[PDB]
């Protein structure tokens, strides 16, 4: 909540802040003081209980034992787990917890298309890139938090004595992990040996005091361990926030201008080294947010109507104008709630999302005469109220209504082909159908069709001249598409509220219209033709009533031309959803917007032409029927409250409005829609082969071409992820994945004017901080997929009965046999075994299509293997268990899952394997099962066991270290603690802030603990004062 209260100066009353949901704000500020990591060093195989030797340190008598900073025991991998060391208030419910390589990591790879058919025990190899993109998108969002700086404590632990480390009250367990090297017990063991080379200096915090406000520093430079990937994601989110930070001081001007000086305030704000007001969104962004609401509303009129009543309230509940027919009734009666009206002005503020047409009932059935009085009146009401609407075709439908009524007394020919003077007026709703006679009064004759040449003459020179006015602040950001920045377009001509008098109150645009019309109809009800059915007395009674209306002293014409602009101008700024507004046009024909449409891609580059559903509706915007009969009343009786100082009135009204920080919710929901877009568009543009230019760091991962229908799901997974992360209200980005092509390139809204011209506002989302990080993450996922269990390269199946050394992951021996090598035959599609009659042995169907025999060595593209496992397991698999055949399944990547065993217990691997083949089917493969021997510390006579699998690439990069608790290891694949992971902690040439990111996730980095304060304005607000 940017604003909390607003003690109004004149009133002295603290206004505190509070088919379409109530737009709430995005949870933009989450923060945790715990370790900035999501790659823990969980140890896998526990240690075989060695005999400690060196115990804890010995201060005087006591003996201080310290928790081993790194995981110790047999084999310790680097199992990915977002916010594993999180010690903050909360976290955006959405993370990534992958089980150590020893478990089915398969589940985390089943978002996109996996759900439904795939067995909970296997992932869909076909939808892997699509499923890894969504998997990382959750590893990003999960990690989008700020790093509060906590409370340090000067460490007095010898080697690191002098360094200011960080407390960690939540759970003191962290202090051990946090700083590896701090107080290292000389117990020479893989782990301890490494931690020994740690630079005393690197530990703790770097910088000195810094911007110490009060007693706490503004932003320290902790040094704690923090995987470069996570540290980089947050260093991105910190930027996402700062990006949309709003200078607190300027807030006074924004309110001052957005309200038109009617309301002037002051809001003291203590400027500090830190401070953060994420309330600002650039106009650059706000437009991608506008065309966004344009997508969710779509043709659906029911979702657009909520917007025009949202305004129809604010408008009425703030206007000085009070409509009441008492005066009108009296005046008329002698000689004898107005939603329609308010839903006509609030209708203009959205003229372009929902036009207001005239209810068909209003028109007087074209087959009726003008002599028919009830009819000619239903017509007079259809004019007085015409301009009051926002239909680009009203000036015609009106003129036409009368061209209908008197079809016999004034039989004038209508230019538009296939249409005649007797065509139902409603019918005319296209700039093409406009009669030429109407487009040029001259065409009609004065004596041929007197009334018409006089009626068209009237409209051609009386229908209000459109206009405009600025609105809102300049330091805001347009947020509007077609009409110039922070500046609306009004139907009638507007003017600065003049000091009430007899002049401005009879000279308004509408006063003229109401006048000259009544004037015109008074001569119509007095036509010679009328005689036929109109009595002489009743013909006079007609002039009697129509004159009452004309002369009635209505004060709305003045309001709708001096006071109504100043409301919309303001009201159009305090709304969570800015006004979408296509330009107004009076009679200019060829240019009167026929259609308005959103395009999920410029027609040019748009494969599979798909117009915007909106096109189907006759009028370009959701045609909301307004009754003329009602509007006319409202228009003919708007007296204002006796005592009325426009200054004080508008002041008091717009006070409560700026108290509800709904103006900033708009800027916030905006900068998140631009994030959820530059990220959605990217994820769906990365799964299709062709399509919008977005860096594809994950192009190697196998992923079939995403159709239009498939995308909508990669789209719902992305859009639905954002909402969960920032807990939002209503639509957001799902509008894109509910119809049309979810495969969006660059959004653009354009209206075509009958004059055959298409103005097209392109709206490209300005650099999405969230997405910039995601890309860096996808890029990392390639060089570090093992940390997510996925493994690159083909799987060999040659049976190996060695009783020696094994490491399916990174095999030292040379690839059993390359694919295009000598004698290897690729198994053809379907992989069909062909039983052979008589002695001959069963032989496999070759890729060259000519059946070859099994004994030998085949290359199985996983696609084939999956469409015949049954035949594989019963013919080639056995031929493999017997050292006769050597398969080479080909999977670009996949989810491996290894099981460690005792190098001393002789056990065949075939069973542990077929458990696998068994679950493979077309719908999906289960995690490849490797079997690695637990690294033995003492020379032990190993037992002979036969292994079958092992990869071509080295995928044991995941493996962090083996036997940290030993001076070394005697048997299993030994792996010392690699210095590379910690260039910061170990290496003397480190450079604060230097990553490695694209290539290798560093652990002990140099994060930048922030300490932001969130000023929450609440100032005084003085009105303008009469004069």
């Amino acid at each position: 909540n940017a604003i909390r209260s607003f003690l109004t100066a004149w009133d002295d009353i603290r206004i505190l802040s509070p088919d379409s949901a109530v737009a709430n704000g995005p949870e933009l500020i989450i923060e945790d003081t715990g370790l900035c990591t999501s790659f823990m060093l969980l140890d896998n195989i526990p240690s075989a209980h060695l005999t400690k030797e060196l115990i804890g340190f010995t201060w005087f008598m006591q003996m201080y034992q310290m928790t081993p900073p790194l995981p110790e025991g047999a084999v310790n991998r680097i199992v990915c787990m977002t916010n594993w060391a999180s010690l903050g208030d909360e976290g955006r419910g959405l993370e990534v917890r992958l089980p150590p390589p020893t478990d089915s990591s398969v589940h985390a790879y089943k978002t996109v298309l996996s759900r439904g058919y795939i067995d909970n025990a296997q992932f869909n190899p076909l939808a892997l890139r699509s499923n890894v993109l969504l998997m990382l998108l959750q590893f990003t969002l999960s990690n989008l938090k700020i790093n509060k700086s906590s409370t340090f404590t000067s460490d007095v632990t010898t080697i690191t004595s002098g360094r200011m480390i960080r407390a960690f009250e939540g759970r003191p367990e962290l202090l051990a992990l946090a700083y590896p090297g701090r107080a290292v017990l000389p117990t020479q063991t893989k782990n301890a040996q490494f931690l020994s080379t740690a630079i005393a200096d690197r530990i703790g915090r770097l910088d000195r005091a810094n911007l110490i406000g009060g007693e706490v520093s503004a932003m320290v430079e902790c040094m704690e361990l923090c995987d470069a990937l996570t540290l980089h994601i947050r260093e991105t989110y910190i930027m996402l926030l700062r990006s949309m930070h709003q200078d607190p001081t300027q807030i006074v001007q924004i309110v001052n201008e957005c309200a038109n000086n009617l309301l002037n305030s002051t809001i003291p704000i203590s400027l500090r080294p830190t401070i953060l007001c994420p309330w600002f969104a650039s106009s650059e962004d706000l437009r991608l947010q506008q065309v966004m609401h344009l997508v969710n509303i779509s043709s659906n009129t029911a979702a657009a109507l909520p917007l025009v009543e949202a305004l129809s309230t604010l408008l009425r509940s703030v206007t000085p104008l009070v409509l009441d027919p008492t005066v009108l009734t009296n005046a008329i009666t002698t000689i004898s709630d107005y939603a329609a009206f308010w839903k006509c002005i609030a209708s203009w503020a959205y003229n372009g999302l929902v036009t207001t047409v005239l209810s068909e009932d209003a028109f007087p059935d074209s087959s009726q005469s003008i002599t028919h009085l009830p009819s000619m009146w239903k017509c007079l009401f259809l004019t007085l109220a015409g301009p009051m609407t926002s239909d680009p075709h009203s000036p015609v439908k009106v003129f036409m209504a009368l061209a209908n009524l008197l079809a016999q007394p004034e039989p004038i020919a209508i230019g538009v082909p296939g249409m005649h003077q007797t065509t139902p007026a409603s019918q005319f709703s296209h700039p093409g159908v406009w009669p030429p006679g109407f487009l040029n009064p001259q065409l009609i004759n004065p004596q041929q069709a007197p009334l018409l040449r006089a009626f068209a003459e009237h409209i051609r020179a009386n229908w209000p001249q459109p206009s405009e006015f600025g609105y809102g602040s300049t330091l805001q950001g347009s947020a509007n598409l077609f009409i110039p920045s922070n500046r609306m377009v009004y139907p009638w001509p507007n003017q600065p509220l003049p000091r009430l008098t007899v002049a401005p109150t009879y000279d308004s645009a509408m006063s003229n219209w109401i006048s000259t019309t009544i004037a015109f109809f008074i001569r119509v009800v007095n036509s010679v033709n009328m005689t036929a059915t109109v009595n002489d007395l009743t013909r006079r009674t007609m002039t009697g009533v129509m004159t009452a209306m004309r002369q009635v002293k209505t004060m709305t014409p003045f309001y709708i031309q001096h006071m109504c602009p100043t409301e919309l101008s303001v009201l159009a700024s305090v709304t969570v959803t800015p006004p979408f507004q296509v330009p107004f046009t009076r009679l200019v024909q060829n240019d009167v917007i026929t259609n308005v449409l959103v395009a999920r891609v410029d027609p040019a580059q748009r494969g599979d032409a798909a117009v915007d559903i909106r096109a189907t509706h006759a009028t370009f915007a959701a045609a909301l029927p307004v009754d003329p009969a009602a509007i006319v009343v409202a228009m003919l009786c708007g007296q204002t409250e006796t005592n009325l100082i426009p200054s004080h009135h508008y002041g008091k009204a717009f006070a409560p409005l700026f108290a509800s920080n709904a103006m900033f919710t708009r800027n916030q929901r905006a900068v998140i829609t631009r994030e959820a877009f530059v990220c959605a568009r990217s994820a769906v543009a990365q799964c299709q082969d062709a399509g919008f230019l977005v860096p594809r760091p994950l192009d190697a991962l196998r992923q079939f071409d995403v159709t239009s229908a498939a995308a909508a799901e990669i789209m719902h997974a992305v859009n639905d992820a954002f909402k969960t992360a920032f807990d939002l209200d209503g639509a957001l980005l799902d509008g894109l994945a509910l119809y049309g092509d979810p495969r969006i390139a660059d959004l653009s809204a354009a209206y075509l004017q009958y004059g055959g011209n298409v103005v097209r506002e392109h709206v490209p989302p300005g650099p999405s901080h969230i997405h910039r990080a995601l890309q860096q993450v996808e890029s990392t996922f390639m060089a570090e997929m093992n940390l997510f269990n996925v493994a690159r390269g083909n799987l060999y199946l040659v049976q190996t009965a060695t009783n020696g050394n094994w490491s399916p992951m990174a095999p030292v021996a040379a690839p059993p046999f390359v694919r295009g090598g000598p004698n290897v035959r690729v198994v053809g599609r379907f992989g069909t075994i062909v039983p052979r009659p008589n002695g001959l042995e069963p032989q496999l169907i070759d890729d060259g299509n000519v059946p070859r025999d099994i004994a030998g060595d085949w290359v199985y593209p996983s696609d084939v293997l999956q469409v015949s496992v049954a035949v594989f397991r019963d013919y080639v698999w056995p031929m493999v268990k017997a050292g006769r055949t050597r398969v080479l399944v080909e999977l670009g990547h996949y989810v491996y899952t290894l099981h460690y065993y005792d190098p001393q217990i002789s056990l065949d691997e075939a069973p542990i394997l077929e458990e696998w083949l068994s679950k493979i089917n077309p719908a999906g493969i289960p995690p490849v099962p490797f079997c690695i021997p637990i690294p033995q510390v003492y020379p032990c006579i190993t037992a002979r066991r036969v292994h079958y699998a092992f990869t071509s690439e080295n995928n044991n990069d995941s493996l962090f270290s083996t036997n940290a608790a030993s001076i070394d290891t005697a048997f299993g694949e030994n792996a010392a603690v690699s210095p590379l992971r910690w260039p910061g902690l170990v290496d003397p040439n480190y450079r604060v802030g230097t990553n490695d990111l694209p290539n290798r996730i560093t652990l002990y980095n140099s994060l930048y603990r922030y300490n932001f304060t969130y000023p929450t304005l609440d100032g005084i607000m003085y009105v303008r004062s009469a004069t």
Binding site: L206, A209, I238, R242, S243, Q250, V992, N995
Partner: protein, 411 residues
Amino acid sequence: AQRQFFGLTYNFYGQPAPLFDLNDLQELAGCYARPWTSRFSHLAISTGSLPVWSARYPSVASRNIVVNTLLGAHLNPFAGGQITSHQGITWRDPVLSSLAPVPAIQPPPVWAVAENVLLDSNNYPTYVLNLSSMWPINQDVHIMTMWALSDQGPIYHLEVPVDPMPAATTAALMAYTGVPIAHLAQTAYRFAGQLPQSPDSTMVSTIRWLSAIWFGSLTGRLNRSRTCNGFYFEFAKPALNPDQAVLKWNDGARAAPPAAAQSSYIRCISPHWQHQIVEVAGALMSQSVTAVTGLPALIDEATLPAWSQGVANLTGNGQGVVPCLDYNPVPMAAARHLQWRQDGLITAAQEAQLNNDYTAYALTIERHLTAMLVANPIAAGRMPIQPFNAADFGQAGQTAAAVALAQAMFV
């Protein structure tokens, strides 16, 4: 850290005693009569865009211009060793905090009024033997020095290395995004004035990178389509508060590290800096850097006032000096708008438009100062305006060379 600041006391302009009276001591914002850690105190709480200036202080740089002569009038230490006292006013104790009336029983020696007294710093042995407590005094005196070595606008110092921004700098700078230049000067100054930092500290090389990154924006070279490293300053309409700067972050076409170092002192000859919170902020924001790290070199004697001629260790004349490229607000912004038109940010119609809207604004700055100098002369007592004379305000020196420096500083 650092302890060896060579200063220089403010000029008298031909007046008897230092330009300030007794009331200036008990009017300073913040900590009573403590001149240390003052400057940006009256701006601690922002109410609006309108520049904070009262009756006695007729301008923005008025608060600082006064704390300068008031500062030098009580700076016998570093230049004599003693503590002295001016008009019955002295410091509490060796730490040098607020100024109280001369203590009885054992009063200090009366200060011998003198113009432009060279400060050696090491002359006062108590300073180094109590650095962590009286550290702000180093930053402040440095300010007074940069302000004293000029009769027309504070001479700060730009730089920029030959290579791109460090990896620790880019991560530290992404925190001062939505922060006006007026506030960046407040956060920069309040930083280097409260605890002894190192010349190679992360917050020092970033704040310096933030100052030189601001000059390019002020010249127009680093606009919306040409960032130094993703950072720039978007300028609003000059008729709608041109003081707003803000360090916006983008992903456009960055420039390129220059072939060599562009170390160069800059000044604002036009007396406009006095009322412009943007100019005073840009000056003091750079001074925060040359504080923790003494002058990279000596200042050029080429022009400057008649009193800064050949200072001890501040202004030289040999080969170890760095030229001072002084500009003028009006022609600078007139050339700043011209840069925007060259790359296509503004229309060729908004070129001659922004010039008339700004020259009218800068006129308000001129109409104000001229009306204040006449109201508050100089022989009266104080110097809240600083006698600039009305013969100037538009005699732009080598501003055209300062612009050519920005084009060279970001190739």
